[PDB]
Amino acid sequence: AVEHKQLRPLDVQFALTVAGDEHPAVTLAAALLSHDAGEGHVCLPLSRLENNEASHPLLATCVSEIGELQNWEECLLASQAVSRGDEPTPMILCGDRLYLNRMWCNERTVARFFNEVNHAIEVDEALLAQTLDKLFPVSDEINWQKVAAAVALTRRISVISGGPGTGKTTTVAKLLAALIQMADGERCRIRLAAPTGKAAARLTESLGKALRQLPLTDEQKKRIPEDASTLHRLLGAQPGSQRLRHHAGNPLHLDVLVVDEASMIDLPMMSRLIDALPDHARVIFLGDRDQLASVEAGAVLGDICAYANAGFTAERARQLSRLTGTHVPAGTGTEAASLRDSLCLLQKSYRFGSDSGIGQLAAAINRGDKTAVKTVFQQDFTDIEKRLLQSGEDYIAMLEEALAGYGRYLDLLQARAEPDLIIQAFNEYQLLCALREGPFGVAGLNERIEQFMQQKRKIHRHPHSRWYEGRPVMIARNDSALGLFNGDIGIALDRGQGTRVWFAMPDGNIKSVQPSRLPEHETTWAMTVHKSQGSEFDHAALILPSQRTPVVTRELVYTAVTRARRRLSLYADERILSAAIATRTERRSGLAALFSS
Amino acid sequence: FEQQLIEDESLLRYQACADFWRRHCYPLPREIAQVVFETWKGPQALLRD
Amino acid sequence: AELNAKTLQRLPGDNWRVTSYSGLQPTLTPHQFPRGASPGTFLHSLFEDLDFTQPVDPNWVREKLELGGFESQWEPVLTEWITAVLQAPLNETGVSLSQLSARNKQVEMEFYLPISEPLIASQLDTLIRQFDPLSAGCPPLEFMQVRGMLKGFIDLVFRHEGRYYLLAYKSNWLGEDSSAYTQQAMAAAMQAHRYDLQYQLYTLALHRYLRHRIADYDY
Amino acid sequence: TFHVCHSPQREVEVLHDRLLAMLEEDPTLTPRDIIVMVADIDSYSPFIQAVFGSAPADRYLPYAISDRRARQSHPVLEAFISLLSLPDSRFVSEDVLALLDVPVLAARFDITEEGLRYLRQWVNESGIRWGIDDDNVRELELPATGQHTWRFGLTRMLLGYAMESAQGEWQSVLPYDESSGLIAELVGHLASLLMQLNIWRRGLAQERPLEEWLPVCRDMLNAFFLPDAETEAAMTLIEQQWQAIIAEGLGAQYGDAVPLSLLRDELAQRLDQERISQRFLAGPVNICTLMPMRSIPFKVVCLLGMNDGVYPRQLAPLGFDLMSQKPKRGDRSRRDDDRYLFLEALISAQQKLYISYIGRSIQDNSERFPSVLVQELIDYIGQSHYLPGDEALNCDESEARVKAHLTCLHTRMPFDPQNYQPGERQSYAREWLPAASQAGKAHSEFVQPLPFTLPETVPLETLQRFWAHPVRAFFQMRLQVNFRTEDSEIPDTEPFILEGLSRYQINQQLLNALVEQDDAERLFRRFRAAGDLPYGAFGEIFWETQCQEMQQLADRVIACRQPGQSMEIDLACNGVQITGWLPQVQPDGLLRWRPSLLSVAQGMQLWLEHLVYCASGGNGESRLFLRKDGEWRFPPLAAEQALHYLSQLIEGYREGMSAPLLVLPESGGAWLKTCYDAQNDAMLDDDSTLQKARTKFLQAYEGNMMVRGEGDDIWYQRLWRQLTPETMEAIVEQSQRFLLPLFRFNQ
Amino acid sequence: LPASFIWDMFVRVLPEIPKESAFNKQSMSWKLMTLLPQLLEREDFTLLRHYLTDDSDKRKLFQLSSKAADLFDQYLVYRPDWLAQWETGHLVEGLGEAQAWQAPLWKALVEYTHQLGQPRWHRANLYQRFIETLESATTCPPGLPSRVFICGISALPPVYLQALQALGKHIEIHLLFTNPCRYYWGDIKDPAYLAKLLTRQRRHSFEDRELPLFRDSENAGQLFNSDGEQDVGNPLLASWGKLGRDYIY
Amino acid sequence: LEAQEMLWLLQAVMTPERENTLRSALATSMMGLNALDIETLNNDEHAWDVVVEEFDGYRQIWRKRGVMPMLRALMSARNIAENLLATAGGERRLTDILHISELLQEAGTQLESEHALVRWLSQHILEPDSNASSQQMRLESDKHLVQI
């Protein structure tokens, strides 16, 4: 890539320190491996290093041996920096793919966890079918949620892949209800994990509103999962040291563990979660397959759910037909029966169907760009609008449409109403931008919206006060003392006691905090696509820059489309939208080879 | 003609004692460094002496 | 024993301060010049140090750019821009800057103007708006009652054919690159930067200086 | 008036009150006619700005202070001076982190403040002390150890970015498991700095002629610094002074080589040449030194710093100047100039003269003599004037009475009630009026009866954290006040000895390795690869004696060791649920090992574990093995006694949350074991035991000059400042109530 | 400032003068850094040969050159006759021991700045050239002001008074002098100078009445001692105003 | 301990957003609050809001006026000097607080940054070296004391 050519100083210093007095081939290989680890690729194939490098014959003149070191494997194994997995070396070459030692250890840990430990818990199928019939009301046609709950309660380790608006939390509630109703005398210490605190709060309020609806018992209500914890707080991560409380010696005393939003889980956090699990806990992963990649290097959920397109096994199809009592299709061929059995795919979305263009556009994002053009083009399904953004007049038209997007918010702000309706109106319309600075970014769009509200008589702003009435703020760091998490919005207004920021807590209350009490505060008229994950907005509007950037890819537009509930607007060029769909953010990892054997 | 006066010379004295300990006690073998360890634990004990 | 702290009855001093006007408020082109306070002061020092009668030498401009630390490529455009500025006359009769001798010019004249009355902004801005035509818009500035001295540094005062003239320099000009700097844009810049009070105080100081120095003086 | 003060802060504080009194007394007295001239403006203007900025809105008079000009960018010029001393520097880690403290050098290499906060602990924990390269170690005539350098720490951080710490060493360098993700990119910034520190170290070492030093400062400024909005003038001043130095050197046409230290000293002299300000503002009251307005006719003239030694300044001659040997009329001298400035200040005073000096020291109340000029002035006053009280008494006695009447001996502290008496002198400080009136409430006691309801489910970890330290558990859990002390700074040398937390961590890892009969030599190489061990043979001797001590401990530990797993504990005591987990529960009982000394806190922890273990089954002893043959043993008990003692500990826990439970473990256990008799199971009441237990309590509370005592703690100093005998008897009674089954069941 | 006004009069009266002097302090230090190792073989510099040739990384040489440049600048300001005699090559009778290493150093400095392309002119010789071109000139040169006010004692150091007397022949100079006493309280040189001082009197500016300099003119000789010092009755004026004594003298 | 209390107070003034440092600094012996006062300050959100607002005002005074005006306004508004003078044994602690304030003013007048003075105070706490200015003075001179 363009960023891959401009070498970071970390990769150059790594190549000069590790190789040093060795051949320049090892230096170039270490620099390319460090750059691919910085970009997010777990493994480095030797074919790309051999073919797509111009200095590859030149290093062939650098090495001088009896066999002349024509192969890359002999040239790497001749140095003391690369071994086969026996010597304590920084670089590891095992399957004609060079990685680092930490990445190789975490990849082997993930492959061991998803290949060997995932055994089949055999339970009674008749009582499980009775609980699935008494919990799920639909039993006339094929329901993917019932099959997902059956395959999650059957196996120990199960991955549930589904998009937003498909009723995943109701499936988790029915799964936990059937789990407690199956094991009556056995106690179940159910635990819930989340990567972020805001997603943990959403998971707590969603499972609270979902599990209280189902009829339970006095011993069943006592075994309700109380709270969802952060993954750093569940394992006991410290700010200074990386030492965990439950690292290798004492595992977490849990019976079942439901980890929501597995798309934002990187490889070292997944490997640290795997090493903390005991030999009897059953883990249920939640997340979307085509969602955005993790923060750090690694792509666990995508490489797991890549085998979901093949299907289930031949015996597992009859097992699911005996469990659910319906017709379950079978997958052709068998490569890895355990991982293909542990997977599931959710296709029936309940909050939107084929009549709405949002789900059709989300299905056309994973397909070619012409399918998305055809989805936007004919009749627009009264849900998706497309506005071309090239010049300044298109920018003025975008600000004019954003005035109509934030119209109810300004109408409730100017009328001096209660702040709860103001936050409820603000949480319906949202702009999503890619970058941060420049004319196309967070700080550009926020300052332009503030200047436009300074121009037209909608929001009065003092230039030196910095806390005018009506500004939306968001926090960047978590704060358990104040009860606000990262990615939570607050609205600053004057209730009569002074300018205070009101936050809408997930428990149904509103909290008025002093602006001097806020640790972090950034204007959130337009959010980044990475920082808007987990939330849901009724009317979303994507704004993409005209300049080519590696941030705008297929997963970014997929997360921008699925962020909207009903209405979605676009402000981008046609060539940028055509190029972002075809350019998929691939992350090279050894899970494709380890799971194939 | 122009010189800066320092009030505390304990830091430079400790640095010179550490330099002496580095240039003397480090290339010694085990049979000599055992007796050096039996006399003083580190350079701080020698400086205190 | 009982003890009490004294309470101050009268204020220790009135609002007295020595303030100024600012306290009361192709590839090489001059449009592509970096806009800042330091290039403005550098151009002001260049216009102060250069003699108007002597012709501009390019090696002198190169030496001044070496002393200031700017780029060497800007110098042959800078000397021709300086000669184009000096060739253009600035008067109602068409008097250029090359006709001013060394005795006629007075560069960077510093004045201290006394004031004993409390300077009220409301009583002064109405008197300004009564006569100044540029005060149609421009909502009035707010400043405290200043009793004392006003500092000022006039850029140039020069005489010609028995008539005195004042000259000041402004060099920020960040927002204009085309030929749009007409009289309307310059008047809008005067109303925005509020240079009317500065030139009014300059006329008052020059009138007081010519009344004190020259006997039987008419404005 | 002559005013004797005790402190310069007190001197300007009396000066401000006297100037306010002079402003209140004379209504036709403008503040522009008042001038305060200080002899030493460098050591007084902080105090003047302090006591003139601290005035309230009804007491504030305007002030403008003339002093030496501060630097336009104070850390940037010092960072450039330190960069000019680069080959002469030893490259200490604090000297590089102080270079990274400047935001210009941090913003040049894209290092943020959070990145600097990560790099602080990354340098402190990875063993980076001194030395950029190994060639820098060999250049200083030192043996090349290869460890505890910047290259060693850089290789350690890069190996930690590549390899986990559990894998092992690669090139006798243990990896650093902290920097693993993208945050180790900041390590790639730090290694981007030191490489630049390798460039200018080898470049500025060789002597160069004056024509070659021209682009050096410019290349250093565009290499190490980034131009910001604030620090443009600093870099411009650096370039201007450097080009002026080179122009004045080449004007003489110097051909020989000029070293780096001469230009560094000349730039350091031309950056600290900021002259004292002579500006006069007619608005505020002018605070300035003597020279600027020698002849100005001010009404109120104040003279500060008129003590001996400071004024008049005596300047030492050069020693070989011909003007000092033969003086003429027009010869400049500092002494005569100051003695004429004092006369011009006396003449220029129109209405009021206020001379103040330091007459008494604030340290030991020593008498300080004033200047010779002020002494001659008060002598001329006493010999030229007399008071109407004693019209004909004497000549010397009337002189002494006049000099004592004019001398106002002010108080040492501003809260003194002498200053607030009505009469001649009366201060205007309203903030110190109720403090000097002594009509305020005293500091009440910290212990107060607080309402506390004991919850249903109390974990075992909360009880362990309570009985580990009860006052700390009262502070950090009930009222959530945890006194956070700042961490220690990075030491300036490699560790030669093992002491403190590092030795305890080495002993803990060695005891955990020897309890499984692992290879001690592999752990020796692992600890030597991290630099935690001394270099060479001394680290081997330290590892051998620690291996001998840990083998002596392990021969007693694994003599009665059985494989045991962690079990669950669910108890119901007094309607309170206790849920927890006990690790390594063997069928023989409880087995714990720690490389520490015989203490009462570990015995309390083992007793709590034995109570929570015997209450749900588990017939067997509980054993803990410490160093120096220290052993805590508890026999198995029935469920009744275990539940009774657990209810007693639960009552102590719920009592410790309302009021601070004053149960000192160490001192209370020492007092108890001095007073307890294990043979008869009864406490002795004779006076000899009561005199020895007091000695044990004073030995364990306040330790010696080598051992940190129990009283030297931030949690105990908040409650009491001095250990009263009433609180001592209260601690004794609480330790007799609670710590009694510790020594009752000890065997 | 007085040095700035003196240099402005030097520029206005005397043409073809360089804007920066060749005898700058840093310039003289950089010249003496080059000239002092050339003169170590000389017999007169034997005090410096034990000071410099023992151990030197050009640190003692630079500080010695800076101190000698400071002394040469002080001599350029205060003692022009000593440097005028040292340029010829003759010593001054009655000075200290530290003279045999300064006068050949100053002569070598003059020869070095004359051999180089730098101009000859410095402050001391241009001072005498200014006095000579103001004393011999019959016609007043242009570019000079009408009246010059000197407010204060330190507004002119007591070395430019000869140039001030030369400027007073063509420019009216008002020296506002701030003396604490109204009579004469300074020193004296000779009894033949005492009568010359007694002949001078001060007339009033507004009242136009002449007043004598002393309180008693008949006892004016009894006030001054035989050495030339007046016994001032005020002890503070006698002990504090020696600079005022020299200035009024 | 008074230097550590002044360091905690300066860290609470410099960083008033996080409530942990402010709660650790308010419960020191310099403020003089009981456990019931700390409990009611932790329970009542409005009183903690008033405390955070007045500490932000103290930070504004510290950035605009300096160290000694901020410390004087803190000792005048909280009235801790009168409480330390009324408490038996607090006059020595008050003189130590005043001397530490004078040394902090002398060190902050020479330092440009505000966090640099806090780092200087933490370093001088970590460096117990004896200078002529940084020694303990006499607590009182009018009251007669037995001189050891």
**E67·B1 Cβ contact <8 A:** yes
Chains A and F touch (3+ CB pairs under 8 A): yes
User: Among all chains, which residue has been given the structure tokens 């890069």?
Assistant: D158
- How big is the CA angle at C185 (ends C182 and C191), to the nearest 5 degrees? 140
Nearest CA among E154, E210, E208 for reference residue E177: E154
Give the separation between CA D75 and CA D101, rounded to whole angstroms: 9
Q: How far is F44 from chain A (nearest CA, A)?
A: 13
> In this complex, which of F18, F20, F52 lies closest to A514 when CB atoms are compared?
F52
Domain that holds residue A577: 356-584
Cβ of E63 under 8 Å from any chain B Cβ?
Answer: yes
Q: How far is D177 from chain A (nearest CA, A)?
A: 7
Asked if residue A386 and residue A340 are part of one domain, the reply reads no
Contacts of E66 in chain B (CB under 8 A): 1
**D159·A90 Cβ contact <8 A:** yes
- Structure tokens given for C53: 């009668």
Q: Where are the domains of chain E?
A: 1-15+125-249, 16-124
Asked whether the beta carbons of D153 and D126 are under 8 A apart, the reply is: yes
Give the separation between CA A404 and CA A449, rounded to whole angstroms: 13
Q: Where are the domains of chain D?
A: 1-67+277-448, 68-276, 449-489+562-747, 490-561
> In this complex, which of D446, D484, D488 lies closest to F24 when CB atoms are compared?
D484
Q: Is A167 annotated as a binding residue?
A: yes
Asked whether the beta carbons of D343 and E240 are under 8 A apart, the reply is: yes
- C: neighbours with 3+ CB pairs under 8 Å? D
Give the separation between CA C34 and CA C172, rounded to whole angstroms: 9
Asked if residue A110 and residue A92 are part of one domain, the reply reads no
E1-15+125-249 has which CATH code? Answer: 3.40.50.10930
- Structure tokens given for A57: 């014959």
Contacts of D404 by beta carbon, 8 Å cutoff, 6+ apart: none
- Structure tokens given for C118: 């409390």
> In this complex, which of C1, C8, C16 lies closest to D428 when CB atoms are compared?
C8
Cβ of E67 under 8 Å from any chain B Cβ?
Answer: yes
Nearest CA among D641, D648, D588 for reference residue D618: D588
**A56: domain CATH number?**
1.10.10.1020
Reduced to 3 states (helix: H, G, I; strand: E, B; else coil), residue C175 is coil
Give the separation between CA A144 and CA A122, rounded to whole angstroms: 21
The last residue of a domain, from among A293, A311, A346:
A346
User: Among all chains, which residue has been given the structure tokens 């440009």?
Assistant: F112
Cβ of D434 under 8 Å from any chain C Cβ?
Answer: no
Q: How far is CA D399 from CA D2, D410, E240, in A?
A: 15, 21, 22
Cβ of D233 under 8 Å from any chain F Cβ?
Answer: no
Residue A589 lies in a domain: no
How does strand C105-115 pair with strand A499-504? unpaired
**D428·C69 Cβ contact <8 A:** no
CATH 2.40.240.10 is held by the domain F1-138: no
Q: Is A298 annotated as a binding residue?
A: no
Amino acid identity for residue A145 in this structure: Q
Contacts of D105 by beta carbon, 8 Å cutoff, 6+ apart: D79, D99, D193, D224, D225
| Domain D1-67+277-448: top CATH class | alpha beta
- Structure tokens given for A480: 């358990």
DSSP letter, residue D12: H
Contacts of D508 by beta carbon, 8 Å cutoff, 6+ apart: D594, D595
**A167: domain CATH number?**
3.40.50.300
Nearest CA among A168, A154, A389, A117 for reference residue A291: A168
Measured in whole angstroms, the distance separating CA B3 from the mean position of its chain's CA atoms is: 26
| DSSP, residue by residue, D664-708 | -HHHHHHHHHHH--TTTTS---SHHHHHHHHHHHHHHHS--SSS-
Query: What kind of experiment solved this structure?
Result: cryo-EM
Asked whether the beta carbons of D448 and F35 are under 8 A apart, the reply is: yes
**A13·D191 Cβ contact <8 A:** yes
- Crossing angle (nearest 10°) for helices A357-365 and A554-561: 170
Q: How far is B20 from chain D (nearest CA, A)?
A: 9
**F137·D486 Cβ contact <8 A:** no
Give the separation between CA F62 and CA F66, rounded to whole angstroms: 5
Contacts of D409 in chain F (CB under 8 A): none
Q: How far is CA A425 from CA A411, A471, A475, D654, in A?
A: 10, 14, 20, 48
The last residue of a domain, from among A86, A101, A116:
A101
CATH fold group of domain C17-219: Lambda Exonuclease; Chain A (3.90.320)
Contacts of A258 by beta carbon, 8 Å cutoff, 6+ apart: A172, A176, A190, A191, A192, A193, A225, A283, A284, A286
Q: How far is B5 from chain E (nearest CA, A)?
A: 18
How does strand D565-573 pair with strand D576-586? antiparallel
Q: How far is C218 from chain D (nearest CA, A)?
A: 33
**F17·A481 Cβ contact <8 A:** no
CA contacts within 13 A on the Cβ side of E105: 25
Asked if residue A296 and residue A147 are part of one domain, the reply reads yes
| DSSP, residue by residue, D349-411 | --SEEEEEEE-B-TTT--B--B-HHHHHHHHHHHHH---SSSSSS-SHHHHHHHHHHHEEE--
Question: Taking the alpha carbons of D158, D162, D164, D170 in that order, is the dihedral positive or negative?
Answer: negative
How does strand C147-160 pair with strand C105-115? antiparallel
Give the separation between CA C155 and CA C175, rounded to whole angstroms: 24
Q: Where are the domains of chain C?
A: 17-219
Cβ of B1 under 8 Å from any chain E Cβ?
Answer: yes
Residue of B nearest to E66 (CA): B1
Q: Tell me whether residue E153 is exposed, middle or buried, using C-beta atoms within 10 angstroms of its C-beta: 0 to 12, 13 to 18, 19 or more.
A: buried
Contacts of B1 in chain E (CB under 8 A): 63-64, 66-67
Asked if residue A79 and residue A145 are part of one domain, the reply reads no
Asked if residue A310 and residue A368 are part of one domain, the reply reads no
Residue A593 lies in a domain: no
Residue D566 backbone dihedrals phi, psi, to 5 degrees: -75, 140
Asked if residue A278 and residue A144 are part of one domain, the reply reads yes
Nearest CA among D286, D314, D312 for reference residue D301: D286
Amino acid identity for residue C217 in this structure: Y
Q: Is A208 annotated as a binding residue?
A: no
Measured in whole angstroms, the distance separating CA C131 from the mean position of its chain's CA atoms is: 21
Interchain CB contacts (distance < 8 Å): D and F: 138
Contacts of C149 in chain D (CB under 8 A): 282
Asked if residue A457 and residue A365 are part of one domain, the reply reads yes
- B: neighbours with 3+ CB pairs under 8 Å? D, E
- Structure tokens given for F87: 């408490």
Reduced to 3 states (helix: H, G, I; strand: E, B; else coil), residue D641 is helix
Question: Cis omega before residue D312 (within 30°)?
Answer: yes
Give the separation between CA D371 and CA D342, rounded to whole angstroms: 11
- Resolution in Å equals 4.1
Give the separation between CA A383 and CA A356, rounded to whole angstroms: 7
Which architecture does CATH list for D68-276?
Answer: Orthogonal Bundle (1.10)
The length of chain D, given as a count of residues: 747
Reduced to 3 states (helix: H, G, I; strand: E, B; else coil), residue E243 is helix
Q: How far is D96 from chain C (nearest CA, A)?
A: 30
Helix and strand element counts for chain B (H, E): 3, 0
Give the separation between CA F107 and CA D50, rounded to whole angstroms: 12
Cβ of B4 under 8 Å from any chain E Cβ?
Answer: no
Question: Taking the alpha carbons of D721, D725, D726, D727 in that order, is the dihedral positive or negative?
Answer: positive
Cβ of D433 under 8 Å from any chain C Cβ?
Answer: yes
- F: neighbours with 3+ CB pairs under 8 Å? A, D
| DSSP, residue by residue, A374-425 | HHHHSSGGGTEEEE---SHHHHHHHHHHHHHHTHHHHHHHHTT--HHHHHHH
How does strand D621-625 pair with strand D631-634? antiparallel
Q: Choose which CATH entry (3.40.1050.10, 3.40.640.10, 1.10.10.160, 3.40.190.10) describes domain E16-124.
A: 1.10.10.160
Q: Tell me whether residue E97 is exposed, middle or buried, using C-beta atoms within 10 angstroms of its C-beta: 0 to 12, 13 to 18, 19 or more.
A: exposed
Chains D and A touch (3+ CB pairs under 8 A): yes
D490-561 has which CATH code? Answer: 1.10.10.990
**D46·F105 Cβ contact <8 A:** yes
User: Which of F13, F14, F17 to probe by mutation at the A interface, max A CB count within 10 Å?
Assistant: F17
How does strand A499-504 pair with strand C163-167? unpaired
Asked if residue A97 and residue A111 are part of one domain, the reply reads no
